[PDB]
Structure 1
Amino acid sequence: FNKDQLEEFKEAFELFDRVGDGKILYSQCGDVMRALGQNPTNAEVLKVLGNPKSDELKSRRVDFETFLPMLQAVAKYEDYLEGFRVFDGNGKVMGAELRHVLTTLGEKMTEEEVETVLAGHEDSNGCINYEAFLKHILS
């Protein structure tokens, strides 16, 4: 990251600073990394965080300067397509099945998260065109 990038990222980070000390929590680190355009797995986020324990995740504090190497470490379509094609072969996915797998497999989400992400992407049958959903979620 160059100085301009570091400035935009620092400004964004400070928007996530809820205490005024120029720092975020470890548990916010993943949210900030994803908010800045990265798409890390939860495992990758914890690894760059050092697989923190609950206690340090909730109370150990890091400033932007310490967060930055972690974001860098995190930073370093056809796979995305095949991953969605697992659950397809007419280009659709049941809404009930997608809801179940998204809330019970992988990096399980909440029903509210799934309702939020699925809004506008399902048709009248409750099927999602996954190439379009993927383009949307990659933007």
Structure 2
Amino acid sequence: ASMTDQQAEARAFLSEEMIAEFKAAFDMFDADGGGDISTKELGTVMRMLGQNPTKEELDAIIEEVDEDGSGTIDFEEFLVMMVRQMKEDAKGKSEEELANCFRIFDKNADGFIDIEELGEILRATGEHVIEEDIEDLMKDSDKNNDGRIDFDEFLKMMEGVQ
């Protein structure tokens, strides 16, 4: 077992108790395989539902999963797939409610929030705030610091507003 850096991490993400439940669905696509799934085995499982996909088309679907460059689908490859979906950050990306409030902040209708828009908006409350604290707050919330706040950063921006 060599060249298992990302696999040895996504594998440790689920214990043998979780891996067992994932093995039930994995063995389904693994109908005529043997521990791993292949292109032909996938096409046969798709036809079980009633879909008749292409074999060469399914081969490309596995090529994307072959991050290291194996060729067919493995069991730990099936586990890392669940490891790339529990990313809570991308789980809240579907926040359609945040997209509505997000557009409220950009009253200029540009797509992202600017410091000029949030400056007078926050100062309009009347509190004696300083521009040195407002400007630093914007650059401190953006880990990459692009200049404006986009819907991507908006997720964590409205994640904990206490």
TM-score, normalised on structure 1? 0.31
- Higher radius of gyration, 1 or 2: 2
Q: 1 or 2, which has the higher strand percentage?
A: 1
TM-score, normalised on structure 2? 0.28
